[PDB]
Write a sequence for this structure.
């Protein structure tokens, strides 16, 4: 046997989880916000089921200076991977609605940790996915509680929800406003937008 | 004014630094080793002036579980950036002579911290550089103590030392053994190997 890390397809699943327990989970979602202060470091994620950003809030807790540095070094690499630029080390980080500019697919491993009906997600790993890859995985193609299609299914859903936000006028999200709108993204979008017939 | 982060071109510079001081530094070097246990996390870097790996040892100290996680998440992103694959979270990290396989250019900001003639380097930031970029920067092209040519000069030196190790037979380092030997690397190598005339 193993840890039996549970795959969650939605923050709504947390509503039926144990009330005092530590449960390892994994979920796929777009990075939507970063907040780095001196006492706190917060990562927002959304899946965009109907939409609303930061459904998942993952916490990187820290008390010391060393902790504080580690948290900062972590944020720094995550932003570099996704080409999100940061102020200079030698110069507080606040990033909101990241998805309006970038589209940062991420596979996360967290610890759902709950007490008295309240729960917190602590990060254990994060795998940034390349938009390049994500598009392949969709165009193209451990524990007993994660199917090797869950991740894939998630990526597919995220992108559909993304499509329905693009159409919707009262939504600030639009494929064109993305800093990285290639022609591949265009045609990918168009293809998936044709999988309705 | 600013922090006056000092650019160091060599670990040999540390021999003339203050004996009880905290001095912010920056240096460019290839990642050569990673060690992750439960009490310690160590990053080895080399510049390869004549050669020897791990001239620079940067320490990511940690006492808690949270710290321990942060350190791990940090290592994980660094390896992903450089396409170094790691065992599964749900399954101690020991990576040596990374440069025989990969070539991982890195710009680091550390705190030289010394007491009684002894010094330690604590990480504050690390910028992985893409081999793709590094080759441009060389083929192609803040504080008062870092010139905007230092980084560049360093990259150039590293690669020359690399060339002289390739020639040398008693050295296990060879361009061909690299997991990523493109044709660009070939021709880049050949060009720089022609800048001797």
């Amino acid at each position: 046997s193993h840890k039996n890390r549970i795959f969650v397809s939605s923050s709504k699943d947390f509503e039926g989880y144990p009330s005092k327990a530590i449960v390892p989970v994994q979920f796929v979602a777009l990075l939507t916000s970063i907040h780095l202060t001196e006492t706190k470091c917060l990562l927002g994620f959304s899946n965009f089921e109907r939409s609303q950003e930061d459904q998942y809030l993952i916490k990187l807790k820290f008390k010391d200076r060393g902790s504080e540095r580690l948290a900062r070094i972590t944020i720094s690499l995550l932003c570099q991977y996704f080409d999100i630029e940061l102020p200079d080390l030698d110069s507080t980080v606040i990033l909101r609605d990241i998805h309006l500019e970038r589209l940062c697919f991420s596979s996360c491993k967290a610890l759902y940790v709950s007490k008295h009906g309240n729960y917190t997600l602590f990060l254990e790993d994060i795998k940034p996915l390349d938009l390049v890859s994500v598009i392949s995985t969709i165009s193209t193609k451990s524990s007993e509680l994660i199917s090797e299609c869950d991740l894939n299914n998630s990526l597919v859903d995220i992108f559909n929800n993304l499509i329905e936000m693009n159409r919707d006028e009262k939504n600030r999200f639009k494929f064109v406003k993305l800093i990285h709108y290639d022609i591949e993204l265009k045609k990918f979008v168009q293809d998936q937008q044709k999988v309705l017939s």
Q: What stands out?
A: The first strand of chain A starts at residue 6 and ends at 7.
